[PDB]
Ligand binder design. Structure first.
Ligand SMILES: CCCCc1oc2ccccc2c1C(=O)c1cc(I)c(OCCN(CC)CC)c(I)c1
Ligand SMILES: *[C@@H]1O[C@H](CO)[C@@H](O[C@@H]2O[C@H](CO)[C@@H](O)[C@H](O)[C@H]2NC(C)=O)[C@H](O)[C@H]1NC(C)=O
Ligand SMILES: [Ca+2]
Lengths: 158, 222, 48, 143, 48, 48, 100, 119, 50
């Protein structure tokens, strides 16, 4: 029921899928060939379908409640919903000229799915996530200093 | 004259170093000794040549084995490099993602014509009259070329190089104000078109250079 | 490659030298004069 | 003073933020030029100054705290500038209203304590600053 | 010429007093939460 | 100018960082007595 | 034609865009002949003539030189008043005292 | 006058015992030389400014800081050797590679910035 | 410009001054082309150097 999804074969399959997604995203360039664009849309559709199928398979064998407890699953849900929304908006009656580039950055964040298995660098991430109040305090003080000096410069050399 | 005089000298050391290798091997008959023979070996092939001449710079690299302190500090540097790599990987990954975002944003939008009057390559052709220092009474004929920025975001590698130059805090205002004027795929710049695109550069600088480069030094200190 | 590699290597070596110098004087940099210090010993020697 | 515990501080903080954003939306034009937005912002600054001097007068009924001294100084400077403009260099003294965002930290103990820690951290660096000054003087003399 | 050079202290203050805060806000995060991570790692290694 | 660059900033930058790094590490020993790291360890030790 | 040139000499045009206007006006006067009547006026919270003419002139070689010299002496200062600037321009086109 | 006044009451033999005392010893003769050459020349003219730092470093927080950092620098003379080796290697490589680029007055490779010589 | 039977021109730099200061004759020529045959008469200029 759940042994196959946690197998190392599944891990390597999802790793090769995310590598394919990264290669698809990082292959765009100026004056790129039209056939390269065609392969890019084909890969986008195929990988979106595969990732949706993988998510649905996981949801029917692991449990819905265990997902939202961890911050990784909710982010993946957001990414997949953004991707399907991007595809339906692109192929729907809406042109979305500027939103094409924005939505690519949404699906670019799949590398976190494979960086989450570090467990060696996660100590720093946990510490900086737990010191968020202090980080915000210093950042806000720096922003206030910048704002004050910007207004003073506006008065002086405006 | 000087090169020939130094050329005669180069023969002398190779004779001494070959003599050193044979006697050292005779009584000893690791990879440090391979480097000792590599420096002397490439010289004997001499006497494409440019590659060999460049490679002969390995002469002082074999003084590390002859000094305990130099070897110790080299090993300490290597150990410091090894422990760091977790931070390098994260920084490189984030810089690659930012390069991809910059490619999606400013792909081919950094082109401009030699004179600030033609806004597309279809009319940026031929000759044009240039006014030196803005004076109307001193005109000169110049050719107009549809040029591209030296540090652009045309492909991923170009974006990575441009973001590296930005992260070194060198020429980053020029790139910022070039991206602010970025209008379209194949059209010229517009003065202060999208000032809101500066958020990309500000966020990238804050995340990488201010934050993840100070974590680098802090973790070295720790 | 030449310029990028030189910049990276030089930056790494410069911060390595800086942190080595800093760690060589960590006793002074965390002296905490509120309890004791070598200035007391110097004053004692001067009085001697 | 009984009712001024929760709402007075919040109202003053909101007034400070509104003054900051009003200063942000001002456009300094070259050679005494202006537009309608600046004309409206002049009256907005008038109202903000009225509120600030009312608060300063009320708070007395003070000087020991540095933040209250700063508030008093900026309030009387604003009154001086307004009186001079009405009864008249003229706008050169206008740069003292940039200290309004500064007193926001007073209302923010968090920011304040952080500010106090950062300021207190500067004491060990004064010797390095003196050394830098001496090196600068010596090199300037040599030049 | 003239007294227009006195305004240069605006940039001197903005640089010295700006880099000082920049060097206390982005270094505190890299020295406090980073030293604790190594201490957390050592404590975790004790149980491991 | 080369000597001014080496002494003026490189030496001074090391001196400025050395004091702050020592001062920041001096805060680490002051905050360890209360046990702030223990709270982070206690919160972290129950996650696994 | 009966060209009447309105020049913005408000504060916001000081700098590069002031000498751009001065050159633009000078090149505009080069498209006029002795059959066309021209005058140049400037407005900054108040409208006035940049020269001594006070009305439309024949725009010959002598008169165009005066306007070119006068338009090169203008400076940018004050606020912008389009209502007071177009009223001055519209009223100068209804003079009919003089030859037009 | 003050050098001789100090020597008379301090004896020449003990003059070199103190590091700071010898600093004033070697400066004044430079001062009495340029007063003659005024009416090569700039050597002792420049070297007379050192008296400021000499007699103004007599503190207790700056002098100790400078001395301990110089001692640390002397205690680690091999990282500097590594940096010098890196500079030497990269300078030789640059001389071999970009040494033939012509120096033009309107470019980054100019008469003041070039790979033509090792310095 | 649109509401007053006119035209709008942009002069961002010196290079655009010469071309944009002569294009207003296209707008002024509209009533002449609509007149047709009656607006076709030979006009002689002033004496000028060739
Ligand atoms: C020994 C060869 C490897 C050195 C090295 O690899 C990295 C990989 C990712 C990120 C940084 C490095 C790195 C550095 O040592 C390095 C790079 C930079 I860029 C850098 O910043 C230089 C300029 N600085 C202030 C102007 C910007 C933060 C510093 I400090 C150190
Ligand atoms: C000339 O133009 C003026 C206005 O620019 C007309 O107005 C008269 O001006 C003259 C003196 O300049 C006087 O008669 C009056 O002050 C104005 N009003 C009237 C009703 O005359 C004037 O009508 C025009 N024509 C003449 C011949 O002056
Ligand atoms: Ca205006």
């Amino acid at each position: 029921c759940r042994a196959a999804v946690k197998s190392v074969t599944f891990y390597w399959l999802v790793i090769v899928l995310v590598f394919l997604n990264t290669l698809t995203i990082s292959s765009e360039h100026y004056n790129q060939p039209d056939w390269l664009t065609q392969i890019q849309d084909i890969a986008n559709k195929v990988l979106l379908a595969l990732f949706t199928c993988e998510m649905l398979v996981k949801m029917y064998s692991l449990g819905l409640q265990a997902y939202f407890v961890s911050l990784f699953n909710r982010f993946d849900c957001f990414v997949v919903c953004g991707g399907i929304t991007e595809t339906i908006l692109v192929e729907l009656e809406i042109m979305s000229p500027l939103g094409i580039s924005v939505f690519r950055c949404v699906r670019l964040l799949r590398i976190f799915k494979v960086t989450r298995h570090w467990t060696s660098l996660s100590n720093l991430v946990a510490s900086l996530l737990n010191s968020m109040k202090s980080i915000a305090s210093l950042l806000l003080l720096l922003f206030l200093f910048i704002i004050i000096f910007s207004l003073l410069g506006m008065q002086l050399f405006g | 004259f000087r090169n020939t005089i130094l050329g005669y000298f180069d023969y002398a050391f190779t004779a001494i170093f070959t003599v050193e290798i044979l006697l050292k091997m005779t009584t000893f008959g690791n990879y440090f000794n391979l480097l000792d023979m590599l420096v002397v070996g490439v010289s004997l092939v001499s006497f494409v040549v440019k590659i060999l001449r460049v490679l002969r710079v390995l002469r002082p690299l074999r003084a590390i084995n002859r000094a305990k302190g130099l070897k110790h500090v080299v090993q300490c540097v290597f150990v410091a490099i090894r422990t760091i790599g977790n931070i390098m990987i994260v920084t490189t990954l984030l810089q690659f993602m930012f390069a991809c975002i910059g490619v999606q944003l400013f792909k081919g939008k950094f082109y401009r014509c030699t004179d600030e009057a033609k806004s597309n390559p279809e009319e940026c052709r031929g000759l044009f009259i240039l006014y030196k220092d803005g004076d109307v009474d001193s005109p000169v004929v110049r050719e107009r070329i549809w040029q591209n920025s030296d540090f652009n975001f045309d492909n991923v590698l170009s974006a990575m190089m441009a973001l590296f130059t930005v992260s070194t805090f060198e020429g980053w205002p020029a790139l910022l104000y070039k991206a602010i004027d970025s209008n379209g795929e194949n059209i010229g710049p517009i003065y202060n078109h999208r000032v809101e695109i500066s958020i990309f550069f500000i966020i990238y600088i804050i995340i990488v250079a201010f934050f993840m480069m100070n974590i680098f030094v802090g973790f070295v200190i720790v | 490659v030449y310029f990028i590699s030189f910049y990276m290597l030089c930056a790494f070596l410069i911060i390595n030298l800086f942190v080595a110098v800093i760690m060589d004087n960590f006793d002074y940099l965390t002296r905490d004069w509120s309890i004791l210090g070598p200035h007391h010993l110097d004053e004692f020697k001067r009085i001697w | 003073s009984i009712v001024e515990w929760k709402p007075f501080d919040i109202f003053i903080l909101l007034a400070i933020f509104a003054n900051c954003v009003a200063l942000a939306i001002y456009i300094p034009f070259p050679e005494d030029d202006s537009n309608s937005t600046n004309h409206n912002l002049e009256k907005v600054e008038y109202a903000f100054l009225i509120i600030f001097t009312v608060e300063t007068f009320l708070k007395i009924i003070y000087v020991r705290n540095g933040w209250n001294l700063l508030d008093f100084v900026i309030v009387i400077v604003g009154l001086f500038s307004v009186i001079l403009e009405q009864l008249t260099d003229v706008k050169a003294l206008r740069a003292f209203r940039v200290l309004r965002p500064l007193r926001l930290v007073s209302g923010v103990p968090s920011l304040q304590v952080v500010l106090n820690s950062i300021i207190k951290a500067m004491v060990p660096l004064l010797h390095i600053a003196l050394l830098v000054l001496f090196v600068i003087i010596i090199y300037a003399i040599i030049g | 010429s003239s007294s227009g050079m006195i305004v240069c202290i605006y940039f001197i203050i903005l640089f010295i007093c700006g880099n000082y805060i920049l060097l206390n806000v982005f270094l505190a995060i890299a020295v406090d939460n980073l030293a604790d991570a190594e201490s957390l790692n050592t404590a975790q290694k004790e149980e491991a | 100018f080369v000597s001014l660059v080496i002494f003026g900033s490189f030496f001074v930058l090391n001196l400025v960082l050395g004091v702050l790094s020592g001062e920041f590490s001096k805060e680490r020993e002051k905050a360890k007595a209360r046990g702030d790291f223990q709270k982070l360890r206690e919160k972290q030790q129950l996650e696994e | 034609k009966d060209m009447l040139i309105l020049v913005d000499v408000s504060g916001s045009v000081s700098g590069l865009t002031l000498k751009l206007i001065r050159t633009s006006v000078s090149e505009m006067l080069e498209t006029l002949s002795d059959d066309d009547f021209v005058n140049v006026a400037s407005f900054n919270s108040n409208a006035q003539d940049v020269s001594c003419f006070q009305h439309l002139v024949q725009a010959n070689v002598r008169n165009k030189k005066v306007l070119k010299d006068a338009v090169n002496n203008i400076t940018a200062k004050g606020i912008t008043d389009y209502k007071k600037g177009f009223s001055f321009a519209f009223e100068q086109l209804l003079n009919y005292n003089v030859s037009r | 006058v003050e050098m001789v006044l100090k020597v008379i009451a301090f004896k020449p033999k003990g003059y070199f015992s103190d590091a700071w005392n010898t600093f004033d010893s070697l400066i004044v003769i430079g001062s009495i030389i340029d007063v003659a050459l005024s009416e090569s020349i700039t050597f002792f003219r420049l070297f007379r400014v050192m008296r400021l730092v000499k007699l103004l470093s007599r503190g207790e927080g700056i002098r100790t800081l400078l001395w301990t950092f110089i001692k640390s620098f002397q205690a680690l003379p091999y990282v500097a050797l590594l940096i010098a080796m890196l500079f030497f290697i990269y300078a030789v490589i640059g001389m071999q590679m970009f040494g033939k680029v012509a120096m033009r007055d309107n470019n980054q490779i100019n008469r003041n910035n070039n790979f033509q010589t090792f310095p | 410009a649109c509401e007053n039977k006119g035209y709008y021109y942009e002069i961002p730099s010196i290079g655009a001054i010469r071309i944009n200061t002569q294009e207003y004759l296209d707008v002024l020529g509209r009533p002449m082309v609509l007149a047709g045959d009656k607006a076709k008469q030979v006009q002689w200029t002033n004496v000028y150097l060739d």
